[PDB]
């Protein structure tokens, strides 16, 4: 059926909370009918929230045709750009790019759009007419919306009255052949102008300084400062101190944030959309789980996910609301960023169990609205005076803290008749209203845990923290308190199908001393929160949320919990949920691991049975045995030197600005102390110089399978994890997934990797962020060859033969060189084809665009034959790309030609871009080369000097040869150099490697001759269709100069429009960015001719300096991406009018048109559906760009994809071949 709509754009005041905070310059979409009503209601209520003011959402059926009529009433030209839809760019693009006709509308005009929907999901749309990142922007002020597509033959009604609706946020769905379910929407947004009742910016009352910017959901947020201000008046409970009553509804009542309502067992679906501009958030949902990808049934089980600007996901809770055991009560939904949580980006979810006709009231007297039950399920029983239902049976009192749950504390309160009539027939401590362990008789395990405080030492230099807090087992308390054992985080292991009982005790002082970092905090109480398992939310949450009880403990008391684990699950995270912002930085957290059934745990040294630790061995009768190791990464380490002088204090006490010290398991190893005698950075990692580090080290024999658990207990920063010399599968249950060697991790995430050791040697693992490496977060994996006395042997494995191995000792001198030609990599066979190459490195200036921007300190790789041409200035240098086929053997010859006098900073101190804790670090002259996802001997071709391995670097006048083997079709691999990270990575020494299928040939797209390098080639295969290939490399953190030779400062000088005011920025946000040694900053175009909506038109300015791609309709296209960058901020990639499979191999994956959370080391390959021009083969011009409006698009990261319509004499077609 043909659908129609009428959309208008208006500007009006927006109210975010009852306290009167408002934005005087809001701009939103709205339907035609509701405009007058919305304006009248806004006029009537100057400072009160109105539900009608919210982001726009519309619905349509799969396979329909949609017509939209747009009318403009703003003060500038504007339009609407869509996503994941088929359309002709000549009439519905929403912008004027390339040679296409203009599609935006001046104020007072009208336009029509036509779209076809073929795939279900989410259609996100926004505007591109105004792209400023200042307060004058369009999308930054809340101008966005989404269109939802349902399955075929569906229908929707109202949740309250059941009448028809046109737009909204809450709705219900009916289908003939499929179950009915409820629907929800959730929009993230940040960085919006905010004013108080006095028209001034909000101020932090403790510090009298500026508060952080807006961070809300659906144009609502709930700051804690207002509630604390209300507390200070002495009206509400005087004994409540700061945070313990932050979310308690018995004191303040329900907030203005979204609240979701439903009955027990109702299936639900949640749509998640991120419309923000700058930051990356993490979404966490209590007591619920979902599959990683809804399309396939072989994904993992998750409970949290990361998100980036301009991206979306779908969520489907397992077994419906209430999980497997059917729990009732209040469940909280919030972001896990503690500063953001303090800002008040959180919501609540409510579950009932009795019919609600609208005649009931809350304890405070507020009437409860009705709720229509679903038509295909039995109805809940009607409420009665004897069984009023939740929450009327809780014996609470208004204006005071919630009471304690019954039978939880030893010698606690008794039960009333209401609780007796409401609870189960056989209540026991830890299970009053719902029995999670299925009323069975499984195995029962007991534990005893207490918390202490005792100072911790970090490294050899004496860095230490006197105030550190963590968990310890009751039995080992005396040993650890006497200093006989080394403190570490707490990890315990249990098999599946177990009913767990725990007793918890608090042994903590109630007062936290102040310091330069934090003020005086009164932590007189604490709790216990847990993830991933089934339990009763009412009496086992560990917090105080909504109308529920308070489940905290005073010092010297004891409480007990009960949890159930029904199936195999990965590592789960637990921590405190009351005073996280107060002392979580001090290290109060832990994790537990669930192992396969019938497993056994043995100590790695003596073989005695244990139940806790971070490095153990697992033995199983049937499945192969392996070794387990767990890693913890955390930041905000409050450290003092040996003289007590604070390290990196903030500007003022109590600020949330990061002091900037990291660590792993209370350990660190900064690089500034490993210079050695020669002061050569190339030998930083060699144990022959300064010995092995104090970071965790994994020990195993050759061929031993291993498993690794990865978790983050940090505060706010993101990280990337890389491993050199190994690889693992992406989805363990699904063998069709791709193979990776790098993973991005957010806070409170969990991951698991499996692999095996192919050969003896040493392997390196580290977080490849520049500051992370500079601060010393790295370790080693060691594989012996003989049989040591202090390492047991797995039962099913065969004992290795003995051998006299003299362990090397540090000597302070570099080791000897290696001879890679003497052996072959594992997997290779004698008689394979051979490829050869020649590589040289040098220095040369680089031109970036036609406006004079250039870099006079560039270092690049190049083929030996191409040196003279580039040295004469007749060519513009480009990155290095190599290609090979499966089963080939590659030999590479390397040479270095660097010089000393050409380096700008001989002292090693870089004033711009800056990094914290600068120190003396002279640059080096030697160089090496490293790659990933390929088979090679780690002792001869790893490209690094790690541990006791021989040297793999070459100085001037030397030559080395590597040996690599290809064993599988992986796609794209990344290459870079690790000789000197502080002086070589930033200036452009990196490359890419591509592996293709067997019997493939490459041809130049112009002369049809054989090609060896380039980012635009043609692949011909005997049994497969011909295809075009495009290559792209992303990088940032570059230093540039103008035509006049003056230094340039980004992004300060790249702000459009030209304004003189802008606040401070983070340390790691400096530097320029671009594609393939190119960038197109918009400031020049704006200065030449100031028109906002005509910046992208090449008819006025000309083609950009970024790479240009051409194709004919219907020709298959494949694209490959890599990012060997340096900074930490994530990025997104998006292309207009196309989409692809998430995983090219697994044909059951989902469909999307974006890539999320890209950091250093990310690699992916894309195959377009239907070839160029989409399914319908529409010619025109298309744009590829980033998704970050703030600091990315204005800096010049965009290009043009052109599809010709008529034959050109310079572009032969694929028909001729």
């Amino acid at each position: 059926m043909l659908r129609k709509f009428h959309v208008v754009g208006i500007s009006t005041r927006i109210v975010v909370n009852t306290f009167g905070d408002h934005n005087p310059n809001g701009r939103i979409y709205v339907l035609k009918e509701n405009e007058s009503k919305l304006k009248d209601l806004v006029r009537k209520n100057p400072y009160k929230p109105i539900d009608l003011v919210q982001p726009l959402a519309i619905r349509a059926n799969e396979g329909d045709i949609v017509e939209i009529l747009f009318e403009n009433q703003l003060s500038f030209s504007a339009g609407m750009h869509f996503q994941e839809a088929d359309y002709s760019v000549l009439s519905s693009d929403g912008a004027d790019a390339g040679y296409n006709p203009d599609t935006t509308v001046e104020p007072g005009g009208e336009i029509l759009y036509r779209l076809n929907v073929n795939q279900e999901g989410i259609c996100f749309f926004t505007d591109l007419g105004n792209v400023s990142s200042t307060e004058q922007g369009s999308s930054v002020q809340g101008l966005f919306g989404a269109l939802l597509v349902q399955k075929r033959g569906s229908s929707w009604t109202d949740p309250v009255t059941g009448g028809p609706i046109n737009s909204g946020v809450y709705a219900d769905i009916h289908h003939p052949f499929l179950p009915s379910f409820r629907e929800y929407a959730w929009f993230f947004n940040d960085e919006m102008e905010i004013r108080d009742l006095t028209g001034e910016r909000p101020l932090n009352p403790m510090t009298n300084q500026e508060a952080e910017s807006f961070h809300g959901v659906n144009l609502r947020y709930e700051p804690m400062t207002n509630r604390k201000r209300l507390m200070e008046a002495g009206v509400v409970c005087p004994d409540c101190d700061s945070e313990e009553v932050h979310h308690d509804s018995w004191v303040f009542g329900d907030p203005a944030t979204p609240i979701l309502r439903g009955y027990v067992g109702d299936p639900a679906v949640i749509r998640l959309i991120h419309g923000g501009v700058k930051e990356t958030h993490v979404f966490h949902y209590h007591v619920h789980q979902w599959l990683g990808d809804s399309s396939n049934i072989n994904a993992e089980i998750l409970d949290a996910q990361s998100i980036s600007p301009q991206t979306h996901y779908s969520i489907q809770p397992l077994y419906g609301l209430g999980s497997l055991h059917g729990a009732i009560g209040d469940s909280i939904i919030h972001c896990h960023l503690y500063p953001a949580f303090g800002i008040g980006m959180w919501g609540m979810n409510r579950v009932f169990d009795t019919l609600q006709d609208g005649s009931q009231c809350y304890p405070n007297g507020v009437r409860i609205k009705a709720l229509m039950p679903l038509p295909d399920r039995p109805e809940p029983p009607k409420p009665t005076p004897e069984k009023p239902g939740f929450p009327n049976f809780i014996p609470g009192k208004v204006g005071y803290k919630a009471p304690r749950p019954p039978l939880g504390i030893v010698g606690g309160r008794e039960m009333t008749e209401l609780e007796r009539n409401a609870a189960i027939e056989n209540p026991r401590p830890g299970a009053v209203f719902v029995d999670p362990c299925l009323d069975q008789d499984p195995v029962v395990v007991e534990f005893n845990v207490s918390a202490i405080e005792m100072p911790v030492v970090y490294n050899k230099q004496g860095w230490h923290d006197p105030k550190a807090r963590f968990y310890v087992m009751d039995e080992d308390l005396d040993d650890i308190l006497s200093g006989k054992k080394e403190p570490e985080p707490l990890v315990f292991h249990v098999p599946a199908g177990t009913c767990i009982r725990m007793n918890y005790t608090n042994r903590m002082p109630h007062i936290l001393d102040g310091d330069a970092f934090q003020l005086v905090t009164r932590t007189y109480e604490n709790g216990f929160h847990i993830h991933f398992v089934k339990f009763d939310v009412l009496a086992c949450d560990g917090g105080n949320v909504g109308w529920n009880y308070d489940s905290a403990v005073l010092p010297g008391q004891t409480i007990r919990y009960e949890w159930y684990a029904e199936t195999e699950l990965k590592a789960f995270f637990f921590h405190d949920h009351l005073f996280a912002n107060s002392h979580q930085q001090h290290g109060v957290f832990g994790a537990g691991v669930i192992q396969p059934r019938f497993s056994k745990f043995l100590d790695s040294r003596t073989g005695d049975e244990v139940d806790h630790g971070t490095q153990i061995s697992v033995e199983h009768p049937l499945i192969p045995d392996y070794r387990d190791q767990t890693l913890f990464v955390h930041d905000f380490a409050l450290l003092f030197d040996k003289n007590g002088r604070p390290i990196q204090p903030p500007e003022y006490p109590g600020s949330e600005d990061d002091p900037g010290v990291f660590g792993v398991n209370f350990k660190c190893e900064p690089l500034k102390f490993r210079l050695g005698e020669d002061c050569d950075p190339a030998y930083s990692f060699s144990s022959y110089v300064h010995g092995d580090p104090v970071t965790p080290i994994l020990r195993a024999y050759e061929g031993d399978p291993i498993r690794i658990r990865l978790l983050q207990g940090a505060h706010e920063e993101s990280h990337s994890f890389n491993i050199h010399g190994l690889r693992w599968k992406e989805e363990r249950p699904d063998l069709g997934s791709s193979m990776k060697a790098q993973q991005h991790i957010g806070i409170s995430e969990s991951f698991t990797f499996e692999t095996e050791i192919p050969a003896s040697g040493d392997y390196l693992w580290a977080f490849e962020d520049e500051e992370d490496v500079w601060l010393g977060t790295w370790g080693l994996i060691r594989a012996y060859k003989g049989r040591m006395e202090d390492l047991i042997v797995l039962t099913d494995r065969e004992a290795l033969p003995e051998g006299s191995a003299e362990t090397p000792k540090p000597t302070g001198k570099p080791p000897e060189k290696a001879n890679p030609l003497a052996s072959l990599p594992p997997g290779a066979y004698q008689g394979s084809p051979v490829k050869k190459f020649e590589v040289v490195a040098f220095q040369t200036p680089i031109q970036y665009n036609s406006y004079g921007d250039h870099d006079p300190y560039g270092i690049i790789f190049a083929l030996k034959e191409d040196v003279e041409d580039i040295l004469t200035g007749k060519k513009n240098p480009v990155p290095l790309i190599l290609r090979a086929n499966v089963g080939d053997l590659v030999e590479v010859t390397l040479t270095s030609e660097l010089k000393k006098e050409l380096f700008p900073f001989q002292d090693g101190i870089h004033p711009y871009p800056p990094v914290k804790e600068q120190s003396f670090y002279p640059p080096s002259l030697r160089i090496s080369l490293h790659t990933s996802l390929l088979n090679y001997d780690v002792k001869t071709s790893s490209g690094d000097t790690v541990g006791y391995n021989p040297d793999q670097t070459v100085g001037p006048g030397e030559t080395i040869t590597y040996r690599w083997f290809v064993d599988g079709q992986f796609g794209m691999c990344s290459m870079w150099d690790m000789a000197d990270l502080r002086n070589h990575r930033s200036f452009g020494t990196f490359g890419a490697f591509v592996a293709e299928s067997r019997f493939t040939t490459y041809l130049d797209p112009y002369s049809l001759e054989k090609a060896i390098t380039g980012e635009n080639v043609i692949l011909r295969h005997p049994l497969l269709p011909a295809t075009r290939e495009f290559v792209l490399i992303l990088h940032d953190g570059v230093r540039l100069e103008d035509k006049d030779g003056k230094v340039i400062i980004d992004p300060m000088d790249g702000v459009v429009p030209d304004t003189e005011e802008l606040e401070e920025v983070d340390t790691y946000d400096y530097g320029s960015r671009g594609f393939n040694y190119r960038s197109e900053r918009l400031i020049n175009r704006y200065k030449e001719h100031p028109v906002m909506h005509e910046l992208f038109s090449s008819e006025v300015f000309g083609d950009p300096a970024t790479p240009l791609f051409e194709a004919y309709p219907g020709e298959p296209v494949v694209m490959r991406i890599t990012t060997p960058a340096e900074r930490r901020r994530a990025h997104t990639f998006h292309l207009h009018g196309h989409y692809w499979k998430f995983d090219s191999k697994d044909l059951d994956s989902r469909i999307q048109s974006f890539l999320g959370h890209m950091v250093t080391g990310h690699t992916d390959d894309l195959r377009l559906i239907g070839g160029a021009g989409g399914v319908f083969n529409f010619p025109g011009d298309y744009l590829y760009r980033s998704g970050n409006i703030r600091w990315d698009i204005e800096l010049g990261m965009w290009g043009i994809f052109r599809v010709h319509k008529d034959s050109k004499e310079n572009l032969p077609r694929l028909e001729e071949v």
């Binding site: 499929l178 179950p179 067992g265 599959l291 077994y319 497997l324 399920r377 299925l438």
Partner: protein, 92 residues
């Protein structure tokens, strides 16, 4: 004659849990594993009919189909008797 016919006639009017052998099924973009439960209502020498019937869906382990269903004998992998599927069971 055929023992299966006599056995299913003997077990008339009782609960039963049945699983087929196909890897997965798809219905209008909805994918699930083939697990069914319900009463037995009629027996033929080649197939049997269940009414009412329940399909174990990940999002709704208690969804009731609006029509009866028939299963060929040769398309049977595992089954069991005297079990009520109103109980909650692990699925993954």
């Amino acid at each position: 004659n055929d023992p299966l016919f006599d056995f299913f006639n003997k077990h008339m009017g009782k609960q039963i849990l049945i699983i087929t052998e196909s890897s997965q099924l798809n219905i209008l973009g909805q994918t699930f594993r083939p697990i069914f439960c319900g009463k037995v209502a009629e027996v033929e020498p080649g197939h049997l009919t269940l009414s009412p019937v329940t399909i174990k869906i990940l999002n709704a382990p208690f969804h009731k189909f609006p029509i009866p269903l028939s299963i060929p004998f040769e398309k049977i992998a595992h089954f069991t008797t005297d079990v009520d599927c109103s109980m909650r069971i692990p699925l993954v």
